[PDB]
Amino acid sequence: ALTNAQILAVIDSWEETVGQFPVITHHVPLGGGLQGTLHCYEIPLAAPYGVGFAKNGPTRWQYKRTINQVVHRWGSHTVPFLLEPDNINGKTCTASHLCHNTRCHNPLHLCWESADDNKGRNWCPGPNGGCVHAVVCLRQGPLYGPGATVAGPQQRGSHFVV
Amino acid sequence: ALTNAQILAVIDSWEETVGQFPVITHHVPLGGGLQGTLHCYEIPLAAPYGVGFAKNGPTRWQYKRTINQVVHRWGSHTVPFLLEPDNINGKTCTASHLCHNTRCHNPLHLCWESADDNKGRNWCPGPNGGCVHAVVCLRQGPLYGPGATVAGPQQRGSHFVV
DNA sequence: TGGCTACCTTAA
C-alpha cells in the first residue's frame, strides 16, 4: 500500500513532533558501579500529547496520519521500525525501551526485538556490568540484583540428590 | 489450623511419594562454557501421577491430604515451603524451578521467591557464567544469550541525542 | 484418595 517514500515521510514527521517533547535527564546505573546519563523525550502525561498522538491506554499511545484519504495508525513506538520486518524466526517483533521509560519516545532509546529479548534486558547487568546483548543495553536492568528469595532448595529426608 | 507437627507430616509424606517419581538425568549449561548434570524427579505425563497428586492443568498439579476429616489441597510444588511466609516486601512468593523443568518436583531444584525473581533466572548466565542470585542458580537460564534483535536504535534526522 | 473440570494473575 504505502510507498517506501511515503513511509519515510511518516517517520520524519514522527521524529519532528517527538523531537519537541520535553527532555528529561536521567542518571542510570550502567553496571560495574558506574553511573551514566540519559535523555528521554517523554510524551506529556495528559492531552494534548502531540501532533497525531493519542492515548489508547494508561501507558499506551498511537500515532495517526492520513494519506491520500486513508487514515493510518501505528503504535507510538513502532514507527522508527516501519521498514524493518515484523517477525524474526517466527517471533513477532515489538519496540523495546532501552531506557525502560514508557513515556520516552527517543528512537535512540529503542529497538526492534522479540518479546522475550525485550524482557530479558530487565535483568541485564548493564553495558558496564557485563552485558552481552547483540544490541548493547544503554543501562543495567531495573531488576538486576541478588533478589529476595525466601527459601532455598532443601529436603528433610534424603530421598534426593542434585 | 494445622499444627506445625501436622505440617511437617505433610511435607514428609510429599517428599516420600515424590521420591519415587522416575529420575531423569539432564545435562545443563552452568555457564563459562561449562556443562553440568542434574536429576529431575518428573511427575508422570498422565494419571496416575502419584499418591494425592492430580492435574488441574496441562503443566499444573495439586497435592491433597485429608486431616481430621478435612481435606487440604496445595500446589504440587508449594509444599516444601509451607512453614515459610507467603510474601516478601509485600510481594507474593511462589515456587521457582531452578532446573526450569515443570514436571520435576525435586525440592533440591526449587525455591520460594517472588514472581519477578523467578522470571529473572530465565536470563541468568548461570552459576559458572557469573550468576549473582542470593540463592545461586543450578543452571544458566534457557534464554540467556545475545538475542535476535532485528533493528537497533537509530534516527533519520538529527532531532535527538542519547 | 482418583481424575477430571473450569478460571485466575502477569507486565511489556
Place this chain on the structure above:
DNA sequence: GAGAGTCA
C-alpha cells in the same frame, strides 16, 4: 508490548 472503534 500490541490491535481496532467511534463519536466530533
Place this chain on the structure above:
DNA sequence: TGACTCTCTTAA
C-alpha cells in the same frame, strides 16, 4: 486530527 473508549498476547 482530537480524545476518549474497548479487548488481546505471553508463559510463568
Place this chain on the structure above:
DNA sequence: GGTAGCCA
C-alpha cells in the same frame, strides 16, 4: 506460577 468444585 496458583485456588477451588464435583462425583465416584
